[PDB]
Sequence to fold (480 residues):
Amino acid sequence: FNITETYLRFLEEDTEMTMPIAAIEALVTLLRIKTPETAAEMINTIKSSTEELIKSIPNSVSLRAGCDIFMRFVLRNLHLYGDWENCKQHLIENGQLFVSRAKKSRNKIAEIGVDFIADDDIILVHGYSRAVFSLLNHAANKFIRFRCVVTESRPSKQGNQLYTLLEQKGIPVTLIVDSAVGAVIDKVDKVFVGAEGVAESGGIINLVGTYSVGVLAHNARKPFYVVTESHKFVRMFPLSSDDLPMAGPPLDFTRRTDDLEDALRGPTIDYTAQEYITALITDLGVLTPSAVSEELIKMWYD
Amino acid sequence: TIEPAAFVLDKSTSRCIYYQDLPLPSSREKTSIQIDPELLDNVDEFVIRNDLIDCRIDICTSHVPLIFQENFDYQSLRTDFVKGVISSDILGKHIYAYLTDEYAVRVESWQTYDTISQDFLGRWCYPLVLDSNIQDDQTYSYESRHIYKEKDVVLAQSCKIGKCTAIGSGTKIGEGTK
Fold:
């Protein structure tokens, strides 16, 4: 019952409510029309909706992951096997409840993740994730001892936007280019990376470069980080150095030209392995090594 | 200068022979050292020393208060007392002199106070710390580079510094300091 329109409505909004959250809410609303009890009508419709979303998707898996999570939750729901109405009611409730949970998660983050800041340590935030920014803000509020650093990111000018946002706060800001990151080995103290998806074990999807950063960190023996809230748990694993669903072509040796037509093509998306990251940042207590995989195992049983 | 006591001491029994306070490092007027002959031909192992520091800590037996009561001349406890003991006012009595390789100083002046504070801040005495917290409302925490910070403590960015700094609670520190 319409998802393309919803997609159209949300792309550069975020800020207040997370992009994925809105999608989740929409999914919940869709569910709460055709009845979750009648599984014959419902699950097929859900599948169709997912397919539609995929069709509408260019360069993302996050939405797909969210919908899978939702499905899993729904599956879990009916395990009371008694009165069938209460479960339905609960299902109906869990949509805006999810949104509410986000605030709580943020609050939790503002209490557990504020222990990390030490004497003279330079912080560099990679990509675009709201949670990381919130954490940074909360650290600033606490006034431990830090430095907030930005990047020259290249999707649709994200890095610049981030820099501008930082400027609002007031904290002194200097920039790092995608190429000029190589000089950073010990001076910027700890390497932080924001997430737009967390897979099985160490697998994280963001923007136009993470793997290289991870490699650099490994070389330097630097502390590498994955920072997020709570809505991104995926069952995924790649085979090569990098493997993902792609709309932007990998190594597209552009056709013979003289007056310019199409050129901006390459690895737009980036993955990270298990070995490179030292710490995982989620509101779910204090979990790090391979807890997400365990969670997945608990959930799927497949 | 106030207490540079020249302790003539024993190794076999650890017992004092002479006490003197001199203003010699500050005002060269009365540079003087005496060796009393009353306990000269009984000890034999005479050791001349000066490099020792005041603590003013005493474990006292049943003798001391009675002695005090007896003799009203001892209005003090260091310059008169030890000398009296040496002289045998109460005839034939022993005193102990505990000698430790580890550092021990008492509170006296202002520079000395400062030194004591510095020692406390550093790791000069075996365990002594503020971060352990003693008095109820205390929220002290240990930091690297010999730095002490309580809770509600803030120092701002860009302050290129030497070595060793400590801050109390309820403090707000600005920017750009040497």
Remarks:
- Chain B touches chain A through nine residues (CB under 8 Å).
